């Protein structure tokens, strides 16, 4: 090996005297001229073949011949030349006689070949569309570093006066060096974008496909957006456009193809795992490569620390080895950071692609499912496939690799702790084996308690929705406090479960914070006690600690990853069982264009049997009927003959068990269950088509849409709201028919459309759109309908029976032949820093001080424990042994035990404070809302209230405490590392200014932009799920109008808009990570460097402490900025839950100082002193000096035309809104001065709402639970329902469904009647109750009045004048002024407005 570098093999290859053990280090000549030349060449060669395979299988176009790349190839040639120059000189010497070894001829040969390959790679790169190449930049970096070694070597060996350095090879090498420097300087630039670029036209293209290699691996291309986020906000129009590789159009087809292939090779169910692997695996193995490199380099720290400590001990060492070590430490750290975050990028991008592909596949699949499939599940479970499952497949990609990484890191760490610390490391492995059962049990019971929390919060959410709906009823009856207490009890159960979770979380924090210390104590005890000879130097500790600090994470993350793989396995089963469903047959109903003149009837069927399942009783049996072109046919039959199925069959919903059908032309469908999208009514109608003003106006004036818009606020542009804000049944039917009539298709399959419309508007719709002279006069129109008042105007009427077509023919023959239809007719027709203070005050100032104190204790104890381990490592060896071992181990264990006790203390304290604050903020939100006037409920949307009670409160309950823990922990770890550093090597304060204040103000831009981006992401995730719901609901329409491509495209566009926000957030995380990890690596470098500058003073255990802490700052800083961002996002929940604490609340409820007597409703007098109310200040009063002093016991009604205000009469009676003017006095009492409940109780009411609540009917009969079953049944019987009451399973405890759906309409009516009876106050009311209940209930109330309510004054608002006919008096009014009073009969005799209505 020496005959190669020297003729006689003289100049050695590695003489430690020259390279390591000297104050002036320098590689030998053999080394310079073999290995320092074979490193870069070897690199380029090892990366050439695979790089070429890549540039073959990945092109970006072709790049014009620019300048930069010209100069690059020119320098490559000059390098080839100035490298073969050495070879020509070498042969000039060989031939000329001197005996020269192989090296002096083989080195320049390889160098020249590799420079030529550098030129060839530049040209291949240019022809493959690569602007900035990572392989070339790295090759030039390696070459330049090796060349800098060789160049220092030559410069030294030349400056001396003794040796006459060769002028020739030295000149050639100076040349090679300048050229490689310029080539590296030119590898960091970019070329001119390729000339075949197709996405250049996009105004906002992702800045990544055009970014340097340096900007990429440092994610520097998001600095623009992160600074923009600070200077001014980020809306959805600054979000870049997705890379083409991340769009749904270039992601979903590949997964769909692979899935079809797997299924085809199946027809052993298809394994979605194999497909996800075959699709997203190529891009996901690079994650394995980067993670492997990161794992192997995470262990350079501990080893370079072992070397550095051996240095600080060896005080005969040359001062430059400590610098070599500080440099290697810095460089390993920085490579680890870049590699790690490239891996994280790959994983997050692969999860993003998986989610896009899955949402797309699910959506495209729902539109082909056979009806049986969609029945085999619910709509909620088919939308979860998007909402829960795909999110799991997404969030898993980022951790899955730990399955194999965590064991590798733990194994390397154990092997190193062994190689360093002997067979004692079993003492730590034993604690680790006992952390796995605990972590497993805890991760189990955490889910066990989360399930209970969710099942108990869904109940509260349901009750809260019911209350926010029946706000009015509850506010009238005075039932506020009862529902308050019910919801509070459900809350208490939730809180108990959450406290259990708090104990579990406390134990978890104990583990995460005290794993390294427990492991270290076990190891050190077993080591210093199993043998006296064992000495605890600064190298066995402070190298073992590092391995512990980098062992905790694997241990504590492995159980979470296991549980998440399990959850994802369940999700994958669900998703596969969906994507495997049987699909409809596209070719069962064979169609034909509108011009193919084969058959002259738009429809023909031959004995076709149909069914909704594979083996059930076919609903339709042997049909045959051919509807000629344009002929209007109308199928009729008793309910359940097979009517509603002929349409669903022609539309290809059912399964053609046997037969043959064909439909010629474009179809149109108007099913019985109308389907209306969440867009503008006009947008619905046009159904995505070029508006043609004339035809739109026509179709709208046809189906009687004009009288419909007149009420809806904005007109046809009226956004129908949250899935049909206000539209009503007949309205929805008309809108659907408008859609069908606009589409203007050949065959119109009308499925009992006009059913929900009255006879009059119905006949209009027929005559205008369906009739023989309507809009569809020249369309082949079917009609499966009930109303027999049109069949004459028809063309053919078909009737069936139990799925068999009874008889067909014209109405003429239909009547003549006296056939079945004869029977059918004859039968049927027969943050400003105060949010945080508020959260702290809700937790309680004491518990806050306690949490801070216990944190401080934990961390002062940890720090002093480590300074103790240091002072222990510095114990002198006296007589081959270490003194003070007993004392030191005792104190170390004591400090650690105290640390653990304090970590448990503060975790439990912060969690118990979380419980206190959850309880308090919830109670206050509840009380404030329940006190808000009804105005606050009409104005503010129910969405806001439901959101505060669900999500804002979930944040205050189960997210803030954890974030507070992680934030405080990261903050104090950073502060502690900094204390240890500044104390070991005090001349490091000169790094804090230049390194924290100015590169820890990266968090300005991060926090700022990350907030906007998280918002944009969560504001854009619901659209996908709403679309998918709205598509599952109306899939028959979408499938019958041939509008499937449009909807697939809209799903893709929504998924892409969501990704356009999800992608910059991930990259912002990588931005922050690289920046703050660079800061942490600078901390590592500076601590190590100031420990080297000052050896002679520092103590050789202090250095280990300092560097060991420097090696954790790196992760702590990043987690700290992330948790600051989270605290800024989550704390706003405390400002949300406090919104309604200053909103105008209603008047006081109880007034004891002016308390009303027990018999407050003594006389039932009705004094009206020109009172006046107006819904709002801006509007006009609706009571115009209303005046009457009604005596008690009376029985009078209140009637008025539209805009009369009797409704207002009520609203003001109970004081739902304060008195706008005037007065309303009773029994010498100005109700405006009485206590809200002090009056509401004694004034009965039968609100015009049969609204029940989720409870045992007894609850409705008595929410307060202040009524006895005796009088309960007394009412029920008296209430004319006691019979079916006893008919209930639980006589008085028959708990009903939500809203009282288990009771009939008249049922709930009688229910209100009994409510009033039980109340049995002095005075009562019945607001338009006769207009929503048969005469039975109205008359039963009248009988209760003449017999049970005779004593009760009565002012009643009803439209059925007869409902007040026999009443004592009567009054009306308009424009806010009382119209006429006194008896009703005298009114009629007066021929007044009452006489008018009577004429009506």
Ligand X SMILES: *[C@@H]1O[C@H](CO)[C@@H](O)[C@H](O)[C@H]1NC(C)=O
Would you list which residues are annotated within the binding site?
A: 637-644, 1200-1207
Question: Of the two residues 22 and 600, which places its CB atom closer to ligand X in the complex?
Answer: 22
Q: State the DSSP H helix or E strand holding residue 836, giving kind and residue range, or none if neither.
A: helix 834-843
Question: Of the two residues 29 and 392, which places its CB atom closer to ligand X in the complex?
Answer: 29
Between CA 871 and CA 869 the distance in angstroms is 6
DSSP code string of 1018-1035 = HHTTHHHHHHHHHHHHTH
| Region binding ligand X by CB under 6 A among candidate stretches 14-22, 169-177, 483-491, 1118-1126 | 14-22
Decide: helix, strand or coil at residue 713: coil
Nearest approach in angstroms of CB 329 to ligand X is 28
CB 1222 within 8 Å of CB 1378 = no
C-beta atoms surrounding 303 within 10 Å = 17
Nearest approach in angstroms of CB 280 to ligand X is 57
Phi–psi pair at 1140, nearest 5 degrees? -90, 25
Nearest approach in angstroms of CB 38 to ligand X is 24
DSSP code string of 538-595 = TTTTTTHHHHHHHHHHHHHHHHHHHHHHHHHHHHHHHHHHHHTSPBPPTTSSEEE-SS
- In sequence order, the 6+-apart residues with CB closer than 8 A to the CB of 347 are 284, 287, 397, 398, 401
Site for ligand X contains 202 (CB under 6 A): no
Question: Of the two residues 15 and 758, which places its CB atom closer to ligand X in the complex?
Answer: 15
CB 1042 within 8 Å of CB 676 = no
Nearest approach in angstroms of CB 176 to ligand X is 27
Question: Of the two residues 165 and 433, which places its CB atom closer to ligand X in the complex?
Answer: 165
CB 1363 within 8 Å of CB 1355 = no
Nearest approach in angstroms of CB 1092 to ligand X is 24
Between CA 758 and CA 789 the distance in angstroms is 12
Q: What residue number has its CB nearest to ligand X? A: 17
Between CA 515 and CA 464 the distance in angstroms is 44
Of 3, 7, 14, 17, the residue at the interface with ligand X (CB under 6 A) is 17
Question: Of the two residues 159 and 167, which places its CB atom closer to ligand X in the complex?
Answer: 159
| Region binding ligand X by CB under 6 A among candidate stretches 10-18, 215-223, 1133-1141, 1242-1250 | 10-18
Task: Using CA atoms of 460, 1011, 352, 242 in order, give the dihedral in degrees to the nearest 10.
Answer: 130
Using the 8-state DSSP alphabet, how is residue 1195 labeled? E
Q: What is the CA radius of gyration of the chain?
A: 42
Q: State the DSSP H helix or E strand holding residue 16, giving kind and residue range, or none if neither.
A: helix 16-19
Binding letters toward ligand X, positions 316-355, x by CB under 6 A: ----------------------------------------
Question: Of the two residues 16 and 1178, which places its CB atom closer to ligand X in the complex?
Answer: 16
Task: Using CA atoms of 288, 290, 292, 293 in order, give the dihedral in degrees to the nearest 10.
Answer: 170
- In sequence order, the 6+-apart residues with CB closer than 8 A to the CB of 1164 are 1191, 1192, 1193, 1194, 1226, 1227, 1322, 1323, 1352, 1353
Q: Which of 987, 970, 984 is nearest to 1080 (CA)?
A: 970
CB 857 within 8 Å of CB 898 = yes
Nearest approach in angstroms of CB 173 to ligand X is 23
Site for ligand X contains 18 (CB under 6 A): yes
Nearest approach in angstroms of CB 21 to ligand X is 8
Question: Of the two residues 24 and 201, which places its CB atom closer to ligand X in the complex?
Answer: 24
Nearest approach in angstroms of CB 18 to ligand X is 5
Of 7, 14, 15, 454, the residue at the interface with ligand X (CB under 6 A) is 15
| Region binding ligand X by CB under 6 A among candidate stretches 15-23, 324-332, 588-596, 1277-1285 | 15-23
Nearest approach in angstroms of CB 155 to ligand X is 18
Question: Of the two residues 17 and 600, which places its CB atom closer to ligand X in the complex?
Answer: 17
Per-residue CA distances from 1340 to 789, 906, 1313, 1350 (Å): 37, 66, 9, 13
CB 309 within 8 Å of CB 1053 = no
Count of residues of this chain found to bind ligand X when the rule CB under 6 A is applied: 3
Question: Of the two residues 157 and 940, which places its CB atom closer to ligand X in the complex?
Answer: 157
| Region binding ligand X by CB under 6 A among candidate stretches 12-20, 92-100, 141-149, 289-297 | 12-20
| Region binding ligand X by CB under 6 A among candidate stretches 13-21, 391-399, 1120-1128, 1319-1327 | 13-21
Q: In what order do the strands lie in the sheet with 1229-1230?
A: 1185-1190, 1166-1170, 1224-1226, 1229-1230
Nearest approach in angstroms of CB 17 to ligand X is 3
- In sequence order, the 6+-apart residues with CB closer than 8 A to the CB of 1218 are 1147, 1232
Nearest approach in angstroms of CB 149 to ligand X is 17
Question: Of the two residues 162 and 198, which places its CB atom closer to ligand X in the complex?
Answer: 162
Nearest approach in angstroms of CB 16 to ligand X is 8
Question: Of the two residues 28 and 248, which places its CB atom closer to ligand X in the complex?
Answer: 28
Question: Of the two residues 16 and 231, which places its CB atom closer to ligand X in the complex?
Answer: 16
Side-chain half-sphere of 784: how many Cα atoms within 13 Å?
22
Decide: helix, strand or coil at residue 1185: strand
Question: Of the two residues 18 and 334, which places its CB atom closer to ligand X in the complex?
Answer: 18
| Region binding ligand X by CB under 6 A among candidate stretches 11-19, 301-309, 451-459, 1049-1057 | 11-19
For the chain, give the number of residues: 1400
Nearest approach in angstroms of CB 147 to ligand X is 23
- In sequence order, the 6+-apart residues with CB closer than 8 A to the CB of 728 are none
Using the 8-state DSSP alphabet, how is residue 680 labeled? B
Between CA 65 and CA 76 the distance in angstroms is 16
Residue list, annotated binding site for ATP: 637-644, 1200-1207
Residue 1247 zone, left/alpha/beta (φ > 0; ψ -120 to 50; rest): beta
Nearest approach in angstroms of CB 314 to ligand X is 19
Nearest approach in angstroms of CB 150 to ligand X is 18
- In sequence order, the 6+-apart residues with CB closer than 8 A to the CB of 871 are 888, 1101
CB 183 within 8 Å of CB 141 = no
Question: Of the two residues 18 and 443, which places its CB atom closer to ligand X in the complex?
Answer: 18
Question: Of the two residues 3 and 15, which places its CB atom closer to ligand X in the complex?
Answer: 15
Specify which residues 433 forms β-bridges with: none
Site for ligand X contains 19 (CB under 6 A): no
C-beta atoms surrounding 1019 within 10 Å = 12
Positions touching ligand X (CB under 6 A) are 15, 17-18
């Amino acid at each position: 090996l020496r005959d190669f570098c020297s003729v006689d093999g003289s100049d050695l290859f590695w003489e430690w005297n020259v390279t390591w053990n000297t104050s002036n280090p320098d590689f030998t000549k053999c080394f310079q001229n073999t290995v320092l030349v074979w490193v870069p060449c070897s690199y380029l060669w090892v990366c050439f073949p695979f790089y070429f395979l890549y540039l073959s299988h990945h092109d970006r176009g072709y790049i014009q011949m620019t300048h930069l790349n010209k100069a690059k190839t020119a320098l490559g040639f000059l390098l080839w030349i100035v490298c073969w120059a050495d070879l020509f000189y070498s042969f000039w010497e060989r031939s000329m006689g001197k005996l020269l070894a192989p090296v002096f001829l083989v080195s320049p040969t390889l160098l020249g070949i590799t420079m030529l390959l550098a030129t060839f790679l530049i040209q291949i790169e240019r022809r493959r569309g690569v602007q900035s190449s990572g392989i070339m930049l790295t090759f030039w970096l390696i070459a330049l570093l090796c060349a800098l070694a060789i160049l220092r070597s030559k410069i030294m060996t030349a400056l001396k006066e003794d040796a006459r350095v060769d002028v020739f090879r030295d000149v050639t090498f100076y040349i090679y060096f300048s050229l490689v420097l310029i080539q590296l300087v030119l590898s960091c630039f970019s070329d001119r974008s390729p000339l075949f670029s197709e996405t250049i036209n996009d105004p906002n293209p992702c800045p990544e496909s055009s970014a340097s290699f340096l900007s990429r691996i440092t994610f520097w291309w998001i600095t623009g957006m992160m600074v923009q986020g600070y200077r001014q906000p980020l809306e959805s129009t600054d979000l870049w456009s997705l890379n083409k590789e991340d769009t749904s159009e270039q992601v979903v087809p590949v997964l769909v193809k692979n899935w079809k292939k797997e299924c085809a090779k199946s027809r052993r169910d298809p394994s979605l795992f194999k497909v996800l692997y075959k699709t997203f695996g190529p891009y996901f193995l690079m994650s394995f490569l980067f993670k492997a490199v990161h794992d192997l380099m995470m262990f350079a720290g501990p080893e370079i620390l072992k070397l550095l400590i051996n240095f600080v001990n060896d005080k005969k060492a040359p001062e430059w080895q400590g610098y070599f070590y500080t440099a290697l430490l810095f460089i390993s750290a920085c490579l680890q950071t870049l590699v790690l975050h490239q891996y994280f990028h790959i994983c997050f991008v692969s999860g993003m692609r998986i989610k896009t592909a899955v949402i797309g596949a699910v959506y495209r699949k729902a539109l082909v499912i056979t009806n049986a499939a969609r029945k085999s599940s619910t709509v909620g479970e088919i939308v979860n496939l998007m909402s829960v499952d795909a999110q799991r497949f997404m969030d898993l990609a980022t951790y899955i690799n730990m399955i194999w990484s965590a064991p590798l890191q733990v194994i390397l760490a154990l092997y190193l702790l062994w190689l360093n610390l002997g067979p004692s490391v079993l003492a730590g492995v034993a604690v680790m084996v006992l952390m796995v059962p605990l972590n497993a049990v805890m991760a189990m019971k955490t889910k066990t308690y989360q399930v209970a929390h969710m099942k108990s919060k869904d109940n509260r959410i349901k009750l809260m929705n019911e209350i926010l709906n029946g706000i009015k009823v509850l506010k009238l009856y005075a039932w506020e406090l009862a529902f308050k207490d019910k919801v509070l009890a459900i809350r208490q159960e939730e809180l108990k479960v959450l406290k259990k979770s708090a104990y579990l979380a406390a134990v978890g924090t104990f583990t995460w914070v005290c794993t390294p210390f427990l492991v270290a104590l076990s190891t050190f005890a077993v080591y210093v006690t199993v043998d006296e000879n064992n000495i605890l130097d600064a190298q066995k500790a402070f190298v073992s600690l590092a391995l512990f600090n980098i062992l905790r994470f694997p241990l504590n993350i492995l159980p979470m990853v296991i549980s998440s793989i399990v959850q994802a396995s369940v999700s994958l089963k669900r998703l596969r069982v969906f994507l495997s469903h049987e699909d409809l047959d596209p070719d069962s109903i064979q169609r034909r264009p509108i011009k193919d003149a084969g058959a002259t009837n738009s429809i023909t069927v031959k004995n076709a049997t149909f069914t909704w399942a594979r083996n059930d009783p076919p609903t339709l049996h042997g049909i045959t009927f051919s509807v000629p072109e344009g002929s209007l046919v109308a199928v009729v039959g008793q309910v359940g003959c097979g009517k509603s199925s002929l349409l669903s069959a022609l539309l290809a919903e059912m399964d053609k068990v046997e037969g043959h059908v064909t439909v010629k032309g474009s179809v149109a469908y108007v099913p019985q269950q109308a389907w209306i999208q969440n867009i503008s009514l006009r947008e619905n109608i046009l159904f995505g088509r070029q508006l043609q003003e004339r035809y739109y106006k026509a179709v709208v004036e046809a189906c009687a849409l004009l009288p419909d818009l007149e009420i809806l606020p904005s007109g046809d542009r009226t956004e129908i709201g949250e899935k049909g804000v206000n539209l009503s049944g007949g309205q929805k039917q008309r809108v659907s028919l408008a859609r069908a009539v606009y589409c203007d298709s050949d065959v119109y399959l009308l499925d009992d459309p006009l059913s929900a419309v009255d006879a009059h508007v119905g006949k209009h719709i027929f005559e205008n759109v369906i009739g023989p002279k309507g809009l569809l006069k020249n369309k082949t129109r079917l009609l499966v309908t009930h109303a027999i008042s049109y069949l004459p105007q028809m063309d053919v009427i078909i009737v069936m029976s139990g799925g068999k077509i009874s008889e067909m023919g014209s109405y003429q023959e239909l009547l003549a032949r006296d056939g079945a239809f004869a029977e059918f007719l004859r039968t049927y027709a027969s943050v400003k820093l105060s949010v945080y203070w508020d959260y702290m005050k809700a937790i309680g100032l004491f518990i806050s001080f306690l949490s801070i104190f216990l944190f401080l204790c934990n961390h002062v104890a940890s720090l002093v424990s480590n300074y103790w381990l240091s002072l222990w490592t510095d114990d002198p060896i006296v007589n081959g042994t270490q003194e003070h071992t007993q004392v030191r181990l005792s104190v170390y264990g004591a400090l650690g035990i105290s640390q653990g006790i304090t970590v448990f203390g503060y975790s439990m304290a912060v969690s118990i404070g979380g419980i206190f604050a959850s309880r308090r903020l919830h109670l206050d939100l509840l009380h404030n809302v329940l006190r808000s006037p009804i105005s606050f409920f009409e104005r503010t949307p129910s969405g806001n209230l439901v959101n505060r009670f669900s999500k804002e409160l979930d944040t205050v309950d189960s997210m803030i405490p954890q974030v507070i823990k992680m934030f405080m922990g990261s903050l104090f770890n950073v502060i502690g590392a900094c204390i240890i550093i500044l104390l070991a090597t005090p001349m490091a304060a000169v790094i804090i200014p230049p390194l924290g204040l100015i590169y820890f103000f990266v968090q300005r831009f991060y926090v700022a932009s990350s907030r906007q981006l998280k918002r944009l992401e969560s504001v854009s995730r619901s659209p996908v799920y709403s679309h998918f719901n709205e598509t599952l609901l109306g899939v028959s329409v979408i499938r019958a109008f041939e509008e499937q491509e449009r909807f697939i495209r809209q799903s893709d566009l929504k998924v892409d808009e969501n990704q356009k926000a999800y992608y910059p957030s991930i990259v912002a995380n990588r931005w922050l990570a690289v920046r703050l990890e660079c800061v942490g690596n600078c901390i590592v470098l500076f601590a190590s460097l100031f420990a080297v500058i000052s050896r002679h003073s520092l103590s050789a255990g202090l250095v280990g402490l300092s560097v060991s802490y420097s090696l954790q700052v790196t992760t702590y800083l990043n987690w700290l900025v992330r948790m600051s961002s989270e605290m800024e996002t989550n704390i706003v929940a405390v400002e949300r839950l406090k919104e309604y604490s200053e909103t105008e609340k209603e008047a006081p409820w109880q007034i004891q100082d002016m308390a009303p007597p027990k018999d407050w409703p003594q006389v039932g007098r009705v004094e009206f002193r020109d009172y006046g109310l107006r819904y709002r200040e801006d509007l006009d009063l609706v009571l115009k000096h209303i005046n009457v002093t009604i005596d008690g016991g009376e029985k009078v009604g209140i009637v008025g035309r539209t805009g009369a205000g009797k409704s207002s009469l009520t609203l003001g009676l109970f004081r739902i809104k304060e008195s706008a003017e005037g007065e309303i006095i009773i029994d010498d009492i100005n109700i405006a001065k009485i206590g809200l409940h002090d009056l509401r109780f004694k004034i009965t009411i039968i609100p015009q709402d049969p609204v029940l609540f989720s409870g045992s009917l007894r609850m409705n009969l008595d929410p307060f639970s202040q009524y006895s079953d005796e009088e309960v049944w007394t009412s029920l019987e008296l209430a004319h329902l006691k019979g079916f009451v006893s008919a209930l399973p639980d006589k008085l405890n028959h708990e009903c469904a939500e809203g009282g759906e288990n009771l009939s309409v008249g049922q709930r009516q009688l229910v209100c009647l009994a409510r009033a009876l039980l109340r049995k106050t002095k005075i009562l009311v019945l607001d338009e109750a006769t207009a929503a209940v048969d005469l039975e209930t109205d008359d039963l109330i009248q009988s209760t009045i003449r017999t049970q309510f005779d004593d009760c004054t009565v002012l009643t608002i009803a439209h059925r004048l007869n409902t007040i006919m026999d009443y004592t008096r009567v009054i009306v009014l308009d424009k806010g002024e009382i119209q006429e009073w006194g008896s009703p009969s005298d009114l009629l005799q007066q021929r007044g407005l009452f006489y008018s209505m009577a004429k009506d």
